[PDB]
Amino acid sequence: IVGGYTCGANTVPYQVSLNSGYHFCGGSLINSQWVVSAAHCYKSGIQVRLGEDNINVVEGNEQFISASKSIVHPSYNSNTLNNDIMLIKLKSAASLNSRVASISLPTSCASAGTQCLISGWGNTKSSGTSYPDVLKCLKAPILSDSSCKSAYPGQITSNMFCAGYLEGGKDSCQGDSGGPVVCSGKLQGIVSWGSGCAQKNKPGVYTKVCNYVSWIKQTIASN
Ligand SMILES: NC(=[NH2+])c1ccc2[nH]c(-c3cccc(-c4ccccc4)c3[O-])nc2c1
Ligand SMILES: [Ca+2]
Ligand SMILES: [Cl-]
Asked: What family is this protein classified in?
């Protein structure tokens, strides 16, 4: 997260860190046994880390659970990143409390101008690599479809939306992929891609979760 602030320990209880010996992507807990992340974060040997704040120190509240299976959307396209969503089933259910809690899936899509909270342990520099130890947060609005398409002509599908600031300075970045974009208490987006980080007129692009709710429900119900 570039230009964001320190969230504060366990203030984003649905945030998870996907770990394979280091933090490589974020995710969102949607129930005690399932996490939603981005398809491009897929790899084998994923350990899901819940209740984290400093990812390099065991401070208490952490729950480390191995993924039992990861389900990348069948129509995921790695070249366009269309359908960049994945579900991860946990080997055992997580213990939910005030520090570890799930986030609700939306019933309707959000409108441009909606303010959302984006969080993660990704890079904090637009020009360089600085990864934080604790969780960073950023409040950002969803942009209109015309501004998004004007920024990335020919690259936005109906399963994506832009959120951020066109002036640059505040944005999600590498390491934040797969994490949550929460608006009014509902998970509306998944950090997916962008051109660099926090560059002027190049906002972040997110997977539009409202388009996948029946898919998520049906997939969880059959696995
Ligand atoms: N400007 C942005 N809002 C933005 C958002 C997510 C990004 N994710 C990345 C990204 C860059 C290089 C590699 C990965 C990557 C690839 C495979 C697995 C995990 C991360 C990224 O997600 N850049 C990103 C830029
Ligand atoms: Ca920790
Ligand atoms: Cl277009």
From this structure: Belongs to the peptidase S1 family.
